[PDB]
Design a protein around this ligand. Structure first.
Ligand SMILES: CNC(=O)[C@H](Cc1ccccc1)NC(=O)[C@H](CC(C)C)[C@H](CSc1cccs1)C(=O)NO
Ligand SMILES: [Zn+2]
Length: 414
């Protein structure tokens, strides 16, 4: 029953964070400009939390966080004496109101940045760039590319995912004559393969990998077990962690794929195998079980030894830049979605990605010209109507980059 409890708790956390940070961007742009706010309400329904600070702002929280507001001072909405008169929203300049109404929608964006900057720093799980099929009679076939191996790097440029591999390939195809690929076969030390890409020009229609002959797929390896679950057919059959299956039903195997082939295709029927346990060839008998999602598939309850995924660690400002990139990508995605009108992760990381995506979506939808919205006001001021610093900032950051590389050459031989 924790399903509903947990999903509702997560949804409330997400909505509360988003609305609170939108209204907090509003209130912060108000406070850092002299425009004193009046009320800071978050959510819909019956207020439960109401606090007044030093000035007089009334922070109010509500249980239904489908939208909030920050009310300021208007001569039609209220009236304050000369004590706080030049701090009213309508009395202020029309120039400050542009930054005031833009505080919220940008804030969401900023939030996404941070959130993305938080997930690229810690790490993220991606699929290994694993070649499983070498096409006959292609460029990778002339080089005798190792069928079944994990791509480590292309032209020295290290790759830790599939998109990295395709980018490193596309970038260096028509830039020089050949391409060196560092790749690791199974049970072997890493080795380099040279691809002659001089004669081949471009294929107007076709996968850029099939043009070279690189078929990708699942990661493979030895039939060694890394995990065995409790109350699993493997545990009852005597399979242990560290066992290497040598043969199944007389037929010797050499890959995890053959073992899963024997497992999935024979549910409920016992398989007599021989495994290499601690340098000892030992016979076992295990009976696969009918899978829960598909009784056609046989289920044994084992996980392979070899590592399947990769984790990408990023620094500080590199992660900030990647987060800005992903936020802009989300912006373009929701833009195309609106134009239509007219990946296994590791825990809460997926929830943070969903939070950032929904933040981008909210900052985009509330920045459109609609009746009562921030974008409505930004359009209201748009169709109603410095550089020294602009150059000095780029000058300063260029000097910083140069000095940082100077220190990098020394403080940071064959
Ligand atoms: C999910 N709710 C929304 O997206 C609505 C507008 C809307 C409703 C339905 C469908 C599409 C859009 N936006 C807001 O609530 C803004 C705050 C959000 C960004 C946290 C809010 C708009 S003002 C008011 C809305 C309701 C009473 S007062 C704002 O800008 N405060 O500074
Ligand atoms: Zn707003």
């Amino acid at each position: 029953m924790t399903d509903f409890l947990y999903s509702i708790f997560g949804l409330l956390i997400l909505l509360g964070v988003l609305v609170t940070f939108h209204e907090w961007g509003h209130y912060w742009v108000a406070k850092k400009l002299g425009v004193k706010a009046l009320r800071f309400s978050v959510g819909f329904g019956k207020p439960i939390w109401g606090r007044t600070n030093k000035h007089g702002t009334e922070f109010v929280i509500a249980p239904i966080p489908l939208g909030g507001y920050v009310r300021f001072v208007d001569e039609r909405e209220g009236e304050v004496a000369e004590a706080d008169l030049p701090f009213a929203f309508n009395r202020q300049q029309v120039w400050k109101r542009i930054l005031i109404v833009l505080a919220g929608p940008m804030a969401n964006f900023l939030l996404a940045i941070v959130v993305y900057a938080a997930v690229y720093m810690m790490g993220i799980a991606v699929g290994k760039p694993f070649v499983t099929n070498v096409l006959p009679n292609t460029v990778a076939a002339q080089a005798n590319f190792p069928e079944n191996s994990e791509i480590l790097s292309v032209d020295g440029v290290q790759v830790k995912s599939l998109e990295d591999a395709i980018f490193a390939f596309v970038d260096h195809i028509d830039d020089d004559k050949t391409i060196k690929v560092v790749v690791k076969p199974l049970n072997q030390e890493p080795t380099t393969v040279v691809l002659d890409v001089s004669q081949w020009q471009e294929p107007d229609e076709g996968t850029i990998f099939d043009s070279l002959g690189l078929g990708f797929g699942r990661v493979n390896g030895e039939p060694s077990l890394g995990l065995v679950a409790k109350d699993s057919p493997a545990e009852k059959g005597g399979l242990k962690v560290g066992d290497t299956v040598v043969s199944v039903n007389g037929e010797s195997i050499s890959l995890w794929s053959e073992f899963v082939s024997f497992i999935e295709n024979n549910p409920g029927k016992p398989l007599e195998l021989i495994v290499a346990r601690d340098g000892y060839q030992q016979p076992l008998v295990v009976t696969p079980e009918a899978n829960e999602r598909d009784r056609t598939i046989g289920y044994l309850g084992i996980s392979p030894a070899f590592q399947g995924y990769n984790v990408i660690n990023y620094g500080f400002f590199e992660s900030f830049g990647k987060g800005a990139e992903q936020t802009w990508v989300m912006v373009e995605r929701i833009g195309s979605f609106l134009g239509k009108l007219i990946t296994a992760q590791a825990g809460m990381v997926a929830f943070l990605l969903y939070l950032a995506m929904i933040s981008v979506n909210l900052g985009f939808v509330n920045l459109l010209p609609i009746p009562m919205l921030d974008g409505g006001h930004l359009m209201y001021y748009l169709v109603e109507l410095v550089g020294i610093i602009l150059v000095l900032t780029i000058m300063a950051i260029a000097l910083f980059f140069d000095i940082n590389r100077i220190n990098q050459l020394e403080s940071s031989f064959q």
